[PDB]
A paper describes a structure:
In this study, two fungal chimeric class I TrTSs, Talaromyces verruculosus talaropentaene synthase (TvTS) and Macrophomina phaseolina macrophomene synthase (MpMS), were characterized. Both enzymes use dimethylallyl diphosphate and isopentenyl diphosphate or hexaprenyl diphosphate as substrates, representing the first examples, to our knowledge, of non-squalene-dependent triterpene biosynthesis. Structural analyses of the terpene cyclase domain of TvTS and full-length MpMS provide detailed insights into their catalytic mechanisms. In summary, a novel family of chimeric class I TrTSs converting HexPP into triterpenes was identified for which two subclasses can be distinguished.
Numbering used by the authors:
A (entry chain B), B (entry chain F), C (entry chain E), D (entry chain C), E (entry chain A), F (entry chain D): 397 to 453, 468 to 557, 564 to 588, 602 to 696
Write the structure that this text describes.
Amino acid sequence: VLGDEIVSAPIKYLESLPSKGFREAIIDGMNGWLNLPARSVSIIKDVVKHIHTASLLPSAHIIFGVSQTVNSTSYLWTLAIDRLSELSSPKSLRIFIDEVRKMQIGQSFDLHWTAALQCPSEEEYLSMIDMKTGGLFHLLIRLMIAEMDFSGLVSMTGRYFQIRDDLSNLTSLDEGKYSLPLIHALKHTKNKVQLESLLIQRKTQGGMTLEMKRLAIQIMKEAGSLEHTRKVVLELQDAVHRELAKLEEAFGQENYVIQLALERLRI
Amino acid sequence: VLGDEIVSAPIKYLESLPSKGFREAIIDGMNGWLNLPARSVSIIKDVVKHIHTASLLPSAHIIFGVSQTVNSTSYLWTLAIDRLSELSSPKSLRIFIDEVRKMQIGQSFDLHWTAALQCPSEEEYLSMIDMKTGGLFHLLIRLMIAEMDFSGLVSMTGRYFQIRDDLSNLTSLDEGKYSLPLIHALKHTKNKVQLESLLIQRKTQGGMTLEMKRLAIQIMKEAGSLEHTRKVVLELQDAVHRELAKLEEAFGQENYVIQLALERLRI
Amino acid sequence: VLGDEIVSAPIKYLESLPSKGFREAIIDGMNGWLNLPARSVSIIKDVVKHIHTASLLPSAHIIFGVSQTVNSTSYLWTLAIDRLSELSSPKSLRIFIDEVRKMQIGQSFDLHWTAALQCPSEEEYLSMIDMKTGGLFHLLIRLMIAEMDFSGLVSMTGRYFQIRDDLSNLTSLDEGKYSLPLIHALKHTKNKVQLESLLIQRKTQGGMTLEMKRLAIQIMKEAGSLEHTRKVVLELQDAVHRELAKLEEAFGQENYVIQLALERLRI
Amino acid sequence: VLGDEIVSAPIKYLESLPSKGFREAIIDGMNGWLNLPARSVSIIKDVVKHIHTASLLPSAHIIFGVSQTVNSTSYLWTLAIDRLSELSSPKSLRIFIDEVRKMQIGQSFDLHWTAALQCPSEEEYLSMIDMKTGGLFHLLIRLMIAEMDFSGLVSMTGRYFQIRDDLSNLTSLDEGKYSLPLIHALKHTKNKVQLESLLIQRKTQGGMTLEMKRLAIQIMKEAGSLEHTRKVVLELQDAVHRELAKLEEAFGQENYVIQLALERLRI
Amino acid sequence: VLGDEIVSAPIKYLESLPSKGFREAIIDGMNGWLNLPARSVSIIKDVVKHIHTASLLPSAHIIFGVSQTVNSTSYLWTLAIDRLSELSSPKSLRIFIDEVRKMQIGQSFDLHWTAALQCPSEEEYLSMIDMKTGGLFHLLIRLMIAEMDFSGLVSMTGRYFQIRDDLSNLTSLDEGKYSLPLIHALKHTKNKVQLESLLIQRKTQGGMTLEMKRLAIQIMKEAGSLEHTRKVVLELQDAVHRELAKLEEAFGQENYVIQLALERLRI
Amino acid sequence: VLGDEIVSAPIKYLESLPSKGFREAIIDGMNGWLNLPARSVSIIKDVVKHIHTASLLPSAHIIFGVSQTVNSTSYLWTLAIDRLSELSSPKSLRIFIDEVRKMQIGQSFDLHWTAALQCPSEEEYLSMIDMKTGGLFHLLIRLMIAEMDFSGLVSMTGRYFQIRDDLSNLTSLDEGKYSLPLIHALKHTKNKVQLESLLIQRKTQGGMTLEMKRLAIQIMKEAGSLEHTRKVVLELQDAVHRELAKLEEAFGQENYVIQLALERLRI
């Protein structure tokens, strides 16, 4: 008899590291608007956690290797679908599979843009982040509804989260991911050749050094990208706050925890 | 609008390479016993092909990289579950998830034994290969029945296939996988230290050279492992042929294509 | 007293390897049209050889290292300018420097396109090869005249030489240079993602394997690129042959050695 | 139309980094003795800067790669010769080419001594540094005169600058260059085998560690090399100061800026 | 004429680094019980130092390379046997060779356990450390006696020294050696798979990082290994102190320097 | 109880590979001149075999690693001294240790010359090979005599063996060892810089390629080194044959097996 002690080790490792439960907060804040049993909420939380963990997969692949990490990712997919199988709604499978399909397509495009050293436009990047990030958000929304319109709020929340994380990473690069400040700088700078060469050498050497990071940040600063993205974040935050109010006026109630979660992520 | 042309590229590469359709032959030979519509057979074939391809995932990761390969593996899981969702039977999901769980557990143990340089016993290795290989076989069987006892035939077929492949690889090592001849040699040889050191150096250097392969093969030959495994294969072949007859006498019919498929893999 | 025995060793190494004297043939065939002393022809030959050798710089950098190769390249530049200083014409320096500037700009663009993994258009590639290849050719022409119009013949000869070399290399890849068949295939193929991934992995691993080369060649063949480039070569050959006639009818003489050199490079 | 935006990027990168204008100070201090128009002084400054930059070529080859750096070095040579072509004197080309030849020969010997792990004598090292360093200095002198005897002052200044830089680097190794303290230590030490092994291992590993650097510095200190080189620096400083006076008494004027530049480099 | 200045350099390098003369203290404290001439004591000290240095052979192999280190190890063996040849006793050779044989067998087993990633039992590890460490100790004892029973004191002293060093290293891993806390943790922990994977990845990558070291130390702490080994050390210290008394009562004298040496290593 | 199964594995591996028993032939041919018991001859053969094997230590370090190989080398030294301890002569230890000391010094010089990239002279190389090779030969001779003058015959035989092996290796490089043809070429060639650069790049890259080997052999051939070494081999062979006769006339007997062994190594 062989048990699930080896395949579940990376899963039990990355599911114990602390994290800010923004998705957990949204789950705990939306069941107030439409009432659901505690078991359904727990099932939805488990499914969302499994999907996010599988998206993530020191790093777990450093401790456990690559092949074991891939096997554990497949096991995570199986666990998530098994947990989803217990829901009462009969259309949960279609929602799950199509949202996961969208997330996977967005992730593939995000990987390909970085690998091929081709910079996307702002519109293409926004569409990609919409897919990749809001797939989980409106999977959550659809699963909760099945067991008003939420597309605009989901899109604004995903964009706000992503570009706010971009500012938190830069203002406060070594992976080569094309963020919004990098996209803006690559089209509004005089040292375009220098920035392109920096990206090419980062790809070649496998990473960037501290001096290269300082030079790239300086080139970004002289282009004014770090202010344009801050203005974008301010606009997105205002859009999210105004989108939440339109939903609050239709249900005849105010969510005092979703607003608290948003205030915990203020600018 | 972003399409599935990047995520599906690795999938469309290994699904075009030719292969011996032994599983396809079994599918085409078992629906003769119990009749099924062509659409159900096509769906089952697609599901089995997707599961096998995901198990597999020049190598595709050489052409497309590692991250893209993992993302395409997740996409393959989603495609397989979506295709399975069209079946008429209501218990297909449970069969699918538990068989895939067994396959993943077996694969995890197979990876861990090679990584940790610990040789399993013959019985434990046989149990592992039963899980890992026959999971797909009796997933196929259960899916066809849902839309007599088959456990013995599945177990014997999986073992026969695996150790026959081991002989085809050896008699006619660079990955470090523990086969049956290696397990027998490691317990019935005088140059145990030399074989252990060869395995350790293969792990350290990332591969084995031609001279090391010749030395390992000669050590195996001097221990008589290559004849013990041939006797095991002969016994397994006889067991499979005698197990098929017991099923043929209960359905009141003879399968002239499963027998042909087995004859195509004679010794 | 320190001599030039170390700096000149890489120079004396590649100046002894045999080569097809197409440029030497052009020099020996055009001075028939306009007569020059033997000393001027020898000086022009030496200058052209030095420039070509500097453009080139087992490989010499394998035997002598990288830094010594760069120092020897600078020594080649100094030797070429010193040899040019002995010419009677007073405008040789301007011709030399502007033609060398054109060659260097073309080489820089050729390097950058390969490094950045960005495919040029056919017009851009043709302009780049015009600069890079015909810079030496019409440097030769201008120096010989100084001591009719030749721009069309020079451009046609440079393009014919370059794409003929491309066909000779392909029909009869590991460096990543964007040739004409590759440019045509990248815009007229169905397996665009596979070809792009092959190029990316070639850049990442530092080279391509035999199986990858076979796959890329087969992808190019399925797109019909290898026939389009052959048609282009035939058109360029006809253009060169018709361009030579217009020059032959203006000088009132026929060159029986330039035609022989072209016939030595027939298709 | 292809421009010089890629080839000139490494040039425009290192021409903006700050540096101590000792050569600029010498140019601005010697034109006081013999008067020249501002345009000639600017041309000489540009030529000297281009030659020094080409000699140099985070590091620019880290940001831009190796091939682009070599192409930009060739572009620097072309730019320097083009700028020199505007001078009124007719013998500027010969001075330029022979001084550049001397510099290149000295650099070749300096590279070969380090590569071959053969320690030069003190006289050979002094001759090499004379060539390599004073080539630029008396190129500057000859170009300025063309548009008294200066050989002794140039030699003394070059030696003083080089060994002063050696002391500034050591007293206040990872490249393997044979300095004066290393040459003295290798012939006046008891741990000769240890020092030779340290140099060999530095060559093999590609660099030296902090502990190896401390051990080498301690071995040098125990041999008294760091005091012998300081005495040499003091003697060279006195020689330079006494050589400047002999020139000041022949022109009937005192240079109050060359003396200031020397005082900025006091011991 | 070729001298021993290259072969003896690593020997003269590692014999000058300071060390705590515990073995020297034991030698100086045991000749008080049985009187010996100063020449014999010096010879025994030299032999013991040579044996220990050969066991050891920045690291000397970093400065001098690998082959030179092996040749110097052989030279150390020759020097030790030559020094031993001057002793008056006729059975010194047999004692020397059999004790060195025991030391080499213990070292071989210690290397093999780490290389093969197989954890020994506590009893087997204790036997291995007995051989490997106490071989030198009771070689020293036998050599001094030849020129009461000491086996128990030697065994207890060797074990106390080894596990005390283990605590000094851990409490106050990158080589993969199996200590006592690691052995206890690997059999009394819940995260067995994580610890095994950490060891496997340490072997694969050639070393461990700071985060991996912290994780391993925390896993050991949660298992209570660091307290079990401290209790073991306390028991061993008490055993050594009680074993010394039994020897002190038979010779009718008290050693005031061996006791001081033990007090210098209190807990 | 831990046995000698791990430490003796490389010893039992390299002592089973076939070899031409030239030293065995000399032992079997010289005991005819002076009669010795079979046990003494067997002991001497075992000691010589152990010393040669320790000198040697696919390669055994490839199969078993480096640390295990060093431990087995130390075990070989212990085994050789233990076997020598059974001889009846009382001065065997001094002969053994001083001859082994000479061999080790010669090996150290041979390693250092290759590591430091410094070419020895012909006389110094001959002295080094005399030490390193004839140490074993006249250790054998002295051991047999203890249980006429043989220095000249031993020296001539060692030189003949070594240069014959070098000539056979070259005429019929990747390790960097300075042979006699290489030493002669480095002082009698025109492409000295090219050969030195080839050696430096061989050291840097860790080995030489086939084209580099062909180039080096061609440079050697153009220098006439391959004929000078053949003349040296012929002279050494004549010297050995004339030295054997002088010994044959003093013992009043002819050795019909030493002459056979020499004839088996004719030119």
